[PDB]
Each structure stands twice: as C-alpha cells, then as structure tokens.
Amino acid sequence: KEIVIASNNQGKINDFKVIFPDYHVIGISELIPDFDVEETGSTFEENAILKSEAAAKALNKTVIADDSGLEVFALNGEPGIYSARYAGENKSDEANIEKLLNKLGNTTDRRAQFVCVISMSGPDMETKVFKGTVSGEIADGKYGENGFGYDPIFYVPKLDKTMAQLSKEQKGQISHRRNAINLLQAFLEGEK
Amino acid sequence: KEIVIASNNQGKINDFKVIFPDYHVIGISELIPDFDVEETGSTFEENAILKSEAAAKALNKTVIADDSGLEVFALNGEPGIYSARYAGENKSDEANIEKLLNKLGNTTDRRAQFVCVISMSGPDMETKVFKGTVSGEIADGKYGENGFGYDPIFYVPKLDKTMAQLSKEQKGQISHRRNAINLLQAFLEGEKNV
C-alpha cells in the first residue's frame, strides 16, 4: 500500500502518484526529515542505489530514488554525476551551460546523452535499476525557453529542436526520464 | 531456460540470440517450419499479437512474436507496417531498399525511425505487448553488410554508422528490438514477486 520517494521534489512525487495509484505515495521528508545521503558513487546508478537503499534499510519500506545528468562524449562524460553543480556549488544552470559551452567550444563532435537511472529498493526484494537515455548534440549556444538545466543547449536531431524548444508534454514523450519510468512501469505491471 | 519466438525471420532470431545470451532461443522454424500467419493487422501491435497468439494456441506454450518496421518522416511513415513487403510479396530486402531509396531521391530531411513491437502470449496470461524505437536517418546508399532488412541504409547519428555497420553485439545494445525487449525483461523481473 505504501511507497516512498527519496526526493524533495513535489513534481516527481506527484508524478509517482499516478504510476502508484494503487499505492500511498509518500515523500521521504515525511519519514526522515533530515534525510542526507553522501553520494559517494561514480555513476548515476551507484548514487541512485545509495539513496534508495539508505532509506529502505532504515525504514523497512519500499523506496524509489533517481539520479540524472548530461554526458558529453568529447568531454569524457562530463558533467556526468556533477551535472547540477558543474560550474560551482550555487548550482546555476546558466553558469553550468557557460562552463560546458566554453570547455567544448570549437569541437566538432558534439554528441551527448541525458541519462536517468531509477532505483527501487525494499525488504522483500533485491534492489532494481531502470535506466533511460535520450541522445542528442550540444548546440552552438542557448536555444529555447522551456525546461531547465541544459535543455537550452541539448539539440534533439529527431525533432530538430533543443529540449528547451519542446513543450513539457513533448519533453515527456522522449526524455531519458520517461524512458526510465517506462521500464519501471513494465516491472510494476509485471507483478500482476 | 527457453524462449520460443514466433518469427520466420532468421535475422530477427539472430538478434534475439544476442539479446538473450542466457536463454536457449528457439525460433518457430524449428517447431513449425511452415508457420504462416496472415498479417491482417493495421498496426505493428496487431500483427505481433496475431503471430504470438497463433503460435501459443497451437503449441500450448508461452511464446513471443515480433512485428517491426521503418517509418520515414518525409514519406509520412512509409513503409510502416508494409516494411517487410514494401517492394512486393516476394519480400526481397534488396528490392525494398531500392524502392525506399528511389522514393527519397533528392529529399534532404531523411529522418526515420525503427519500430519494434514484441507481444507475449501464453495459455495462462492475457497477451501483453511492448514497444521499442530507435531514431536515425536514411543514408544515401548501402553501408556495411551485417544485420538484415533496412539495416544497410539506416544511419545512426549517435554512432556515426549504419545499423549494418555495427557488430551483432553493438546492434544489440541500441536497436529498437533491444529497447522493446528491455521492457519485456523488466516485466518478467516484475513477475518474480517484485
């Protein structure tokens, strides 16, 4: 009946209420207000697993965490697990965008991907990982006004648009996150 | 550990063997050499369901089937469900490619998408379907010689290669069929009691 989200994002949590409408969906802050997990991992997957396992082992409940980011091929994976605070600790997207555009710069191979890993851990269960991806190219500079993070510089060839130029619903169709959620839903459907 | 695949396409069976290395993959041609289901569906999903349900009823086993195709933007989704027999009923991959290329003679927006729908059917479950896709562009000619079907003209920008240029292992990491099967395998993992 209950499922907890290792996140402080009411957006994500409400999203999860639709995919767990059979469940009571609870934000982690309701159970561990001071939840704080040291992200000592190397990949999005390791960091997702640390978050969901810390909550699940302390709580004896089923919990979902995630971790997301941009990987740019020419920069050997950067910003990677450092996507949010790429250019500094006050996590300014524009600052992040400017550091990325400047480090890439003249480079012709601008191939990149967004990856979202969703982790699910619990007592009667081994921890499960669901990885979604969406591919594209780093643009010339910023283009578009919707979305956030690196969306203005992430060009999507199959749509001829940056992620920022897409509507929210358009983003919701093709995003790395939608891909990870599809994998989760298939698992959930699986247990019936 | 066995999976029966209700497909007559030997190329598909090969891909499936790459994607299920822990399974004994059994192609329908081993069990019913003249398997022949009338694909009267108007979508990939309908065609896949017809194949999986037909094999499952005749064998009283769980099986999977596959109906896949290529949708080219500039042709508003052609060849689509007609992908296999695009150029005629003899189902010549080479003829299908030539037709598609001719029809795109000068076109500059060559965006296309590979689509794969997997359906699972069995005597103890309602039929279930899973869809995978991969994006690319139609090249100006045939490059590479691995794979099958439209592989030699399906250029994958992510990889700077056509599907036919990729090793069987690499194709299996990124194909539309790999993506559909990931949803399937997640489904199977879900039925092992969470």
Numbering used by the authors:
A (entry chain B): 2 to 193
B (entry chain A): 2 to 195
From the paper:
The Staphylococcus aureus inosine triphosphate pyrophos­phatase is a dimeric enzyme that hydrolyses noncanonical nucleoside triphosphates to prevent their incorporation into DNA and RNA. They can adopt different conformations to perform catalysis, ligand binding and allostery.
We obtained a crystal form of this enzyme in which the asymmetric unit contained a dimer consisting of one monomer in an open state and the other in a closed conformation upon binding of a phosphate molecule at the active site of the protein. For instance, the E. coli liganded dimer structure could not be solved by molecular replacement using the apo RdgB structure and was solved using the SAD method. For this peculiar case, using data between 15 and 4 Å resolution, the self-rotation produced a pseudo-symmetry peak with a 37.5% correlation. The height of the correlations of the self-rotation peaks corresponding to the NCS provides a hint to the conformational variability of the monomers (the correlation values being inversely proportional to the amplitude of the conformational differences). The same case can arise for oligomeric structures following the sequential model of allosteric regulation, in which different monomers can adopt different conformations in the same crystal.
